[PDB]
Amino acid sequence: FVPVELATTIPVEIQQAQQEIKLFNKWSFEDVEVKDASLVDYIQISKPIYVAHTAGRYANKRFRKAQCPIVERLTNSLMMNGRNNGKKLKAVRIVKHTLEIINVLTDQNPLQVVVDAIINSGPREDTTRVGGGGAARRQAVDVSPLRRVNQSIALLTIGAREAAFRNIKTIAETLAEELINAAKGSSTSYAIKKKDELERVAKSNR
Amino acid sequence: PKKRASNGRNKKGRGHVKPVRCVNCSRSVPKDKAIKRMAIRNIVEAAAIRDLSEASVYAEYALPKTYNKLHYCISCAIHARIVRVRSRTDRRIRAPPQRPRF
Amino acid sequence: KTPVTLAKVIKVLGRTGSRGGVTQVRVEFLEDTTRTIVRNVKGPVREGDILVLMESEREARRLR
Amino acid sequence: SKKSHKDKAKHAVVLDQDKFDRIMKEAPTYRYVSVSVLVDRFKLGGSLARVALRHLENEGIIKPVSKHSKQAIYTRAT
Amino acid sequence: DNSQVFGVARIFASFNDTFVHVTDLSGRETIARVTGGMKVKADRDESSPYAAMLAAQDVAAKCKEVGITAVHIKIRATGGTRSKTPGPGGQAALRALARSGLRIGRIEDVTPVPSDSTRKKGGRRGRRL
Amino acid sequence: TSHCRFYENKYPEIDDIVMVNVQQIAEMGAYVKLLEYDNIEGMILLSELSRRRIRSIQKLIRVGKNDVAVVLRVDKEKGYIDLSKRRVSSEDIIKCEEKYQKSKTVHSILRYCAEKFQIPLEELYKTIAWPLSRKFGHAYEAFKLSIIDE
RNA sequence: CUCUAACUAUAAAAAUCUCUCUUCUC
Ligand SMILES: [Mg+2]
Ligand SMILES: [Mg+2]
Ligand SMILES: [Mg+2]
Ligand SMILES: [Mg+2]
Ligand SMILES: [Mg+2]
Ligand SMILES: [Zn+2]
């Protein structure tokens, strides 16, 4: 589509119609919408990005964490252990591989799968420590939608991590399985299982 | 030494008054050293006034109040936050704490 | 059933709890916007969020 | 120094003719092919997982979506 | 009157295990006694507002099945020589009763208050804690 | 293989006294295997664990051993159980031990039979267990009768 | 220089401690 001539020949696919910014030049941010109304404005699929890698000051003020691209937040939460703590290009590669794998299984543009899994795997009611030592219990309270996004990302990455640990499957494949299972309500997913159990426990301690 | 010229009792000319019991700890304490608080409140709080008004027959019910004079002891009164320790130059003042709201 | 309801905060009534990590807000329903509750949140909130509640009769009581 | 897992060989270290007709029969009908997916069915050791996985790029039995190292992403040819 | 079949809600809220006990106008006929401890596990959150909430929902469902559509609240504290201040649960019990469709008429407080009779429990120095 | 709960349903009933073998503990509570029934885990809340005040989790839990239990709430769509240990009376634990011992004897006998015949324990229960429990009310009493009256 | 209104509401357990004390004048 109108290949611009230059002394340096950028590939045609990189030149085709680039007013249509894609995540990895593969997935469209349009067609992706948030089903839940509570967690909108805390999932940042609205802005376009050419890479899930941006050196953004997303930890200076209080609430800029929401404005970070959701895929970028997933990448940042993947790089979580002492053995692999600063490595983020590896996290970007893992997320990219997960996105292609999710595209393979039930095409369902993988950004929508990511969003739906994050919506489903976030708890809606939690507990806090209120017991005065001798009479110590848990106490049922509600969760902030930002903390819902944070917690959903957290359990998704934890489940992928302990699925990949000393296992044949790669981290990308385990993350893709967890995301696919959390797209639906399949209890086989670890994140959705923790969500269900935590909500049940909060129900038990009204 | 005298911490209180009134001795806290507020008796001054009786010798003996009839004691009353604490509402929390049931302390047999004289009726004048039995710091009293007249709790007058609504039988339905402001949190449920709208709900009751919408779901009640007899349009514009008077919503009657509840009255109870609480006879605390003094240890509970210190602990249950009813009465507070004061400066020795502030102990002089006996007026209630300046009209909580006008 | 699944009586999941939504509630948009109109004001935040400080932060409560022995931990000091929970907050208290005044939420108003997406429906019938003249009907409000006071509710406890465990996480960062501000004027504009939409909490998800599995209850509606509950009212927040200060945690001590 | 434990003995809890009690794992068997559980892996075809060398491919066999019946296993070859297997890998070829569900060379299609596996709508996503990778090293871990191939060894998930007990029929590949894991080193020959790559061998059979690269061999299927002979007559276009499967198509590549990405060929980055450390893994592979293949879909059924349509 | 549009044939609002009436009862008396007659909530009894002590400092533990509040009671919700609806009856007809006479009061000699008892229906839907379900209490606060009827519906909670901790054996001590019987006085909690949630226990009274659940009990109120149950009595509302039962009486709505019965035919009674409006109730008369008779709030009673533990009464007698005790604290005789209304329990924490009964307030939420009344709120939940007014929530579940039932109409509300003639709220009354019927706590038994004595004429300084029958010396209180606890001894002269009372409960030391 | 050990499966096929003794009683009428794989999922439990309401307020049925249960019979636990604890496996691990998380922060929220203890997920415990149920040995009275087939295999399904139960959740014992921390606040609903001990008669005394909670001070030592591992002193009372005793990971790897069996104990008494009571069921409070059940889930009849996918399988979940809420359990308590504080609310067990002084006398009920005796009937719990005797029921455990008799049910475990029956389980061991029929597992021996299944291991000898290499047929799933569920099929052998299909042919032996619950028609016997329907006839006599207890498979062990009927076993004693079969010892006496064939 | 003129006025009488709003309201709540927690109590788990925590015993004990050995030396040795030393000037202020222009
Ligand atoms: Mg190193
Ligand atoms: Mg003194
Ligand atoms: Mg005084
Ligand atoms: Mg005189
Ligand atoms: Mg004291
Ligand atoms: Zn007192």
Cβ contact, residue pair F48, E41, below 8 Å: yes
Cβ contact, residue pair E50, C58, below 8 Å: yes
Cβ contact, residue pair A137, F78, below 8 Å: no
Tell me if B3 is assigned to a ligand binding site: no
Q: What is the DSSP string of C10-48?
A: EEEEEEESSSS-EEEEEEEESSSTT-EEEEEEES---TT
Task: Decide: helix, strand or coil at residue F46.
Answer: coil
CATH fold, domain F16-91, is OB fold (Dihydrolipoamide Acetyltransferase, E2P) (2.40.50)
Task: Decide: helix, strand or coil at residue C52.
Answer: strand
Please name every residue paired with C50 in a beta bridge, in sequence order, or none if there are none.
C8
Task: Decide: helix, strand or coil at residue F77.
Answer: coil
Cβ atoms < 10 Å from Cβ of E3:
6
Cβ atoms < 10 Å from Cβ of A16:
12
Task: Decide: helix, strand or coil at residue C50.
Answer: strand
E strand map for A14-137: 125-129
Domain assignment of residue D17, given as a range = 9-78
Contacts F87 to E, Cβ<8 Å? 41, 43
Which nucleotides of chain G does any protein CB come within 7 A of? Answer: 5-13
CB C41 within 8 A of CB C23: yes
Domain F92-150 has CATH 1.10.150.190: yes
Cβ contact, residue pair D46, A104, below 8 Å: no
Whether any strand G atom is under 7 angstroms from the Cβ of B60: the reply reads no
F88 touches chain A (CB under 8 A): no
State the amino acid at position D61 in one-letter form.
Answer: I
Whether any strand G atom is under 7 angstroms from the Cβ of B39: the reply reads yes
User: Whole-angstrom Cα distance, residue B66 to residue C52?
Assistant: 36
Tokens of F20: 């636990």
Whether any strand G atom is under 7 angstroms from the Cβ of B75: the reply reads yes
CA F118 / ligand 1 centre spacing (Å): 52
Contacts A173 to D, Cβ<8 Å? 34, 36-37, 71
> How many domains is chain E partitioned into structurally?
1
Contacts F47 to E, Cβ<8 Å? 42
Instruction: Name the phi and psi angles at F106, rounded to 5.
Output: -60, -45
User: Whole-angstrom Cα distance, residue A155 to residue A120?
Assistant: 11
Cβ contact, residue pair E95, C57, below 8 Å: yes
Specified resolution (Å): 3.5
User: Whole-angstrom Cα distance, residue F95 to residue D76?
Assistant: 61
| Strand B29-30 with B19-20, pairing | antiparallel
Instruction: Enumerate helices (H) and strands (E) in chain F, giving the number of each.
Output: 5, 5
Burial D31-60 (b: 16+ CB within 10 A, else e): ebbbbbbbbeeebbeeebbeebbeebeeee
Instruction: Kindly compute the dihedral angle of the four CA atoms of residues C5, C9, C10, C14, in this order, to the nearest 10 degrees.
Output: 140
H or E element that contains F70: strand F66-75
User: Whole-angstrom Cα distance, residue B92 to residue B89?
Assistant: 6
E strand map for A1-47: none
CATH of the domain at D28: 1.10.10.10
Please name every residue paired with E113 in a beta bridge, in sequence order, or none if there are none.
none
Task: Decide: helix, strand or coil at residue E70.
Answer: strand
What residue is closest to G12 (Cα–C1')? A134
8-state DSSP, A110:
H
Q: What is the DSSP string of D3-55?
A: --S-----S-SS--HHHHHHHHHTSSS-SSB-HHHHHHTSS--SHHHHHHHHH
Q: Which residues contact A2 (CB under 8 A, 6 or more apart)?
A: none
Contacts E95 to B, Cβ<8 Å? 44, 47-48, 51-52
User: Whole-angstrom Cα distance, residue A1 to residue E5?
Assistant: 78
- The burial class, CB within 10 Å (0-12 / 13-18 / 19+), for B39 is exposed
Q: What is the nearest nucleotide to B100, using C1' and CA?
A: G6
Distances (CA, A) of D61 to A200, D41, D78: 48, 19, 9
Cβ-based interface (< 8 Å): residues of F facing E: 47-48, 72, 84, 87
Distances (CA, A) of C2 to B72, C5, C55, F6: 47, 9, 10, 34
Whether any strand G atom is under 7 angstroms from the Cβ of B76: the reply reads yes
User: Whole-angstrom Cα distance, residue D24 to residue D18?
Assistant: 10
Instruction: Name the phi and psi angles at E70, rounded to 5.
Output: -130, 150
Tokens of C25: 């807000």
8-state DSSP, B89:
T
Q: List all residues of chain A from 106 to 165 with a beta carbon under 8 Å from chain C.
A: 124-130, 132, 139, 141-148, 150
CB F110 within 8 A of CB F102: no
> How many domains is chain A partitioned into structurally?
1
Report the residue from F28, F53, F78 with minimal CB separation from A201.
Answer: F28
C15: Cα within 13 Å, side-chain hemisphere? 10
CB A71 within 8 A of CB A23: yes
E40: Cα within 13 Å, side-chain hemisphere? 23
User: Whole-angstrom Cα distance, residue A110 to residue D73?
Assistant: 15
Phi-psi region of B7 (alpha: psi -120 to 50; beta: other; left: phi over 0): left
Contacts B47 to C, Cβ<8 Å? 38, 59
Q: List all residues of chain C from 40 to 59 with a beta carbon under 8 Å from chain E.
A: 57-59
Q: Which residues contact B27 (CB under 8 A, 6 or more apart)?
A: B21, B73, B74, B75, B76, E122, E124, E125, E126
D71: Cα within 13 Å, side-chain hemisphere? 23
CA C5 to the chain's CA centroid: 12
Tokens of D3: 């003995």
B84 touches chain C (CB under 8 A): no
| Strand A138-143 with C36-42, pairing | parallel
H or E element that contains E58: helix E49-66
Q: What is the DSSP string of A153-198?
A: HHHHHHHHHHHHTTSSS-HHHHHHHHHHHHHTT-TTSHHHHHHHHH
- Residue where the block lists tokens 């569900």: D26
CB E84 within 8 A of CB E21: no
Q: Which domains does chain B have, with CATH numbers?
A: 1-97 (3.30.1740.20)
Instruction: Name the phi and psi angles at F145, rounded to 5.
Output: -60, -45
User: Whole-angstrom Cα distance, residue F138 to residue F101?
Assistant: 13
8-state DSSP, E86:
P
> Residue B90 CA to nucleotide G6 C1', Å?
27
Q: Which residues contact A166 (CB under 8 A, 6 or more apart)?
A: none
- Residue where the block lists tokens 């589509």: A1
Contacts E39 to F, Cβ<8 Å? none
State the amino acid at position A184 in one-letter form.
Answer: K
User: Whole-angstrom Cα distance, residue E6 to residue C21?
Assistant: 47
8-state DSSP, B67:
E
Task: Decide: helix, strand or coil at residue A148.
Answer: helix
Tokens of E113: 């208050």
CATH 2.40.50.140 intervals, chain F: 16-91
- Experimental approach was cryo-EM
| Strand F17-25 with F29-34, pairing | antiparallel
Tokens of D45: 């050791």
Which residue of chain A is at minimal alpha-carbon distance from F82? A204
Please name which of A199, A112, A114, A98 lies closest in space to residue A149, comparing C-alpha atoms.
A114
F72: Cα within 13 Å, side-chain hemisphere? 19
In a mutational test of the E interface, the residue from B18, B29, B42, B52 whose CB has the highest number of chain E CBs within 10 Å is B52
Please name every residue paired with A112 in a beta bridge, in sequence order, or none if there are none.
none
User: Whole-angstrom Cα distance, residue E10 to residue E7?
Assistant: 9
F86: Cα within 13 Å, side-chain hemisphere? 16
A88: Cα within 13 Å, side-chain hemisphere? 13
- Residue where the block lists tokens 């990308």: A172
User: Whole-angstrom Cα distance, residue A81 to residue A84?
Assistant: 5
Tell me if B15 is assigned to a ligand binding site: no
Report the residue from C18, C50, C52 with minimal CB separation from A130.
Answer: C18
Q: Which residues contact F142 (CB under 8 A, 6 or more apart)?
A: F132, F133, F135, F136
Domain assignment of residue E46, given as a range = 3-129
Tokens of F112: 């021996």
Please name which of A58, A94, A62 lies closest in space to residue A78, comparing C-alpha atoms.
A94
H or E element that contains A139: strand A138-143
DSSP H helices in chain F: 57-61, 92-117, 121-124, 130-136, 139-148
- The burial class, CB within 10 Å (0-12 / 13-18 / 19+), for B66 is middle
User: Whole-angstrom Cα distance, residue A186 to residue A200?
Assistant: 16
8-state DSSP, F126:
I
Q: Which residues contact E15 (CB under 8 A, 6 or more apart)?
A: E47, E78, E83, E87, E88
Distances (CA, A) of A85 to A82, A162, A166, C40: 5, 16, 18, 35
E strand map for B1-102: 19-20, 29-30, 36-42, 65-71
In a mutational test of the F interface, the residue from E41, E43, E48 whose CB has the highest number of chain F CBs within 10 Å is E41
CA E127 / ligand 5 centre spacing (Å): 10
Q: Which long-range contacts (CB under 8 A, 24 or more apart) does D3-11 make?
A: D10/D42, D11/D39, D11/D42, D11/D44, D11/D45, D11/D46
E54 touches chain F (CB under 8 A): no
8-state DSSP, F132:
H
B47 touches chain C (CB under 8 A): yes
Q: Which residues contact E31 (CB under 8 A, 6 or more apart)?
A: E7, E22, E23, E24, E62, E63, E66
CB F32 within 8 A of CB F22: yes
Report the residue from F45, F53, F80 with minimal CB separation from A134.
Answer: F53
Cβ contact, residue pair A101, D70, below 8 Å: no
User: Whole-angstrom Cα distance, residue E77 to residue B68?
Assistant: 12
Cβ atoms < 10 Å from Cβ of F136:
15
Please name every residue paired with C23 in a beta bridge, in sequence order, or none if there are none.
C15, C41
Cβ contact, residue pair E42, F47, below 8 Å: yes
Residue E46 C-alpha, separation from nearest chain C C-alpha, in angstroms:
16
CATH of the domain at E103: 3.30.420.80
Cβ-based interface (< 8 Å): residues of B facing E: 21-28, 39, 43-45, 47-48, 51-52, 55-58, 61, 63-64, 66, 68, 70, 73
Ion ligand 3 — residues with CB < 5 Å: B 8
CATH 1.10.150.190 intervals, chain F: 92-150
Q: Which residues contact F113 (CB under 8 A, 6 or more apart)?
A: F124, F128
CA A134 / ligand 5 centre spacing (Å): 17
8-state DSSP, F51:
S
Domain C2-64 has CATH 2.40.160.20: no
Whether any strand G atom is under 7 angstroms from the Cβ of B46: the reply reads yes
Gaps in chain A (C to N over 2.5 angstroms) fall after none
Please name which of A83, A113, A131 lies closest in space to residue A180, comparing C-alpha atoms.
A113
